[PDB]
Amino acid sequence: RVNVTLACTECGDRNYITTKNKRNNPERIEMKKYCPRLNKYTLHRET
Amino acid sequence: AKLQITLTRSVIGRPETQRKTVEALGLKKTNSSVVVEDNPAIRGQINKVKHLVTVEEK
Amino acid sequence: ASLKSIIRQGKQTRSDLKQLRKSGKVPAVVYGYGTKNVSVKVDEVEFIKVIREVGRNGVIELGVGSKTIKVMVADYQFDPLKNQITHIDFLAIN
Amino acid sequence: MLLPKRVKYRRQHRPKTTGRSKGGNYVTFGEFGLQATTTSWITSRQIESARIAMTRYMKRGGKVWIKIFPHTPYTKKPLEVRMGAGKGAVEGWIAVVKPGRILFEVAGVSEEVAREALRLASHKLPVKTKFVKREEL
Amino acid sequence: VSSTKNGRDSESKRLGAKRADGQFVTGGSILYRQRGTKIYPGENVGRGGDDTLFAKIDGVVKFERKGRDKKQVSVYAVA
Amino acid sequence: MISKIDKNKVRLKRHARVRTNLSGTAEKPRLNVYRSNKHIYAQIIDDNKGVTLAQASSKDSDIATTATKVELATKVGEAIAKKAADKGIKEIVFDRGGYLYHGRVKALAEAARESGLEF
RNA sequence: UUAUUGGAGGUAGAGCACUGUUUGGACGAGGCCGAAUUCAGACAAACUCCGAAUGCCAAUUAAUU
RNA sequence: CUGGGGCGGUCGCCUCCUAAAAGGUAACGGAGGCGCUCAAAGGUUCCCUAGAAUGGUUGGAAAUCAUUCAUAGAGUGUAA
RNA sequence: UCUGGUGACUAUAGCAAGGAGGUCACACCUGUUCCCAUGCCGAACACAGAAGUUAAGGUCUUUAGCGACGAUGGUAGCCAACUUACGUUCCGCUAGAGUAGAACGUUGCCAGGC
Hints:
PDB class: ribosome
Entry title: Staphylococcus aureus 70S after 50 minutes incubation at 37C
Organism of D: Staphylococcus aureus
Radius of gyration of chain C: 13 Å
Largest sheet of chain C: 6 strands, mixed
Strand content of chain C: over 45%
Oligomer: part of a larger assembly
Organism of C: Staphylococcus aureus
Organism of A, B: Staphylococcus aureus
Largest interface: C-D, 7 and 11 residues
Strand order of the largest sheet of chain C: 1-4-5-6-2-3
């Protein structure tokens, strides 16, 4: 269980931090969050 | 009719509750008289401290 | 098969019952067919001497005031200490 | 030698001794029994001591019933140490008895034989007793 | 040398009723704090994340029965 | 000897569970629908007061007609639609009793949707 | 402070409907006798189908203060 | 800290009993836990519901069952 | 008016029996082409039928054998006093739980055809 920082493609700010199990899901997490500045459900990617 | 209540016993060494009820009746020091009208509201107060005052018709 | 009771007055204080139980009386109640709830009192020695003929269950002629009804022993509160009855229940057999 | 096979807690709070007996104030097994008139704690050692003194004089000539069983265990600190160190270990098992509670019950024997057997078991008990018979009135 | 191992305990959470029956309350006022569904919510009464009963309309509280063995608290707009 | 179970019993139970967070109230009344093994009934009820103000069934004299055993529902829905159109034909909560939303009910449900019933 | 009314809550008692403890009847379960379901009767700070008196919160008009 | 000190043991948070039917309440009083886990153990829609004893693996007297009782007796990631 | 449909009241509204139906309507039954289904079986769900049948559910009767609801009368405890102290005692207040007698086979609202 380690920390995860969902990076943005346009925002460039880490305003979304979650947790996950490296032993369980070792692949990069890819979810669709919402960046206020862009004001549009964009696809965030874990660094 | 009318009622005449008189404090015959002292309030020294008596529970706070009883002390407050005696002051609500109007009695001050020992052997104090007070004339009031008979009603269920007054009766209750006299029944709470019946072993400290003396009631007599009038 | 006979017994004389006395209609008890309403609202009896603890002291009253104590004094009534201090002598030879025992508070009782009557209820059943063709009768309402009436509170009476009987004698202890007169009840035990008239309960050895019919036994536990047996029709008796109680003289509730100025009337005679056929009742039996439904329940009876007994006191283990000093073996004395405290309450008796009479149910109209009719 | 009477004690529960297992208990949830080995430390109680000492049963209160006030009021009259809750239940069991009538003989329903034998014909005669010993009724208590005072309140006190009855240990297992005393219970078995009175039973052995009753059967010894009865010469196995009847049935005996025990209407009391030590349900509460009591602790005791040994070698009188300083106070304040926690509760002690279990010492024995007791049973609270209030006035009007039947202790023993005998049957299948002479009425005068049961009156003498119960009197011998009353000298090993720390409570005033009284000989009573099956009531029915 | 006797030892101990029973000197630990948590803090007390002031639980129970916070508003009396027939008292006037304002929207958002807490009415009950419990661990579960001891009292179900009635009319104009929502349940919080920690099973906390609160009012949504300003009025008087009313504790009534719901079913046969379950209680419930409601609030009426009538002043 | 495995025994059979009532169909109305289970349905009733399910219906009660769906009526725990849904009820009519003048402005938004509930449209209860009762589907039998012969015809289907529907009526706009107001839970707040407890009185009906609409009625439509497949066993009606102006509805009874040898159809395909599914066209009646469509007519039933359009029948109550006009009746509800007279007075109170705005936002209404549709109740599916305790049956599934797919089947004859669906046809009756969409029947009022194309009629104008804003629901 | 009384009077009047409304409400929240599981203590003293009591009870065995659950959890544990227990006594006598009763339990079968193997080419010879031992794991039982009922009947009756007991016990409980960490048992409850029940449940007071007091106290507590409030509301209203009255009455004294 | 401490029924003198020392020795030992403890020091934060969570649940129950003591606690005297609101809430609160002490002791080196009596019992247990936590220093997390989960990408589904989350969200929404929809649909479901133990123990006894007889076709006997000489049988653990409870294979994954037929349908009686279930009447919830269960089940809940974790202590109450 | 009737049976239905949907509500309100604490099972006095429950379970058990012993009955009579009824076919307005319900149910039951007949399938699997049709949308749609089983962790598979058209058992259920769904759709089409609906020939036969009251046998079962079932509506209306009867019974308190259960279950629930429980008058009174007593007293266990307790409030406030008084006494001696309280494994209390006595005098006032409120009066339980268990149990007797008993009551109970539900009352109501609305829409329709009837």
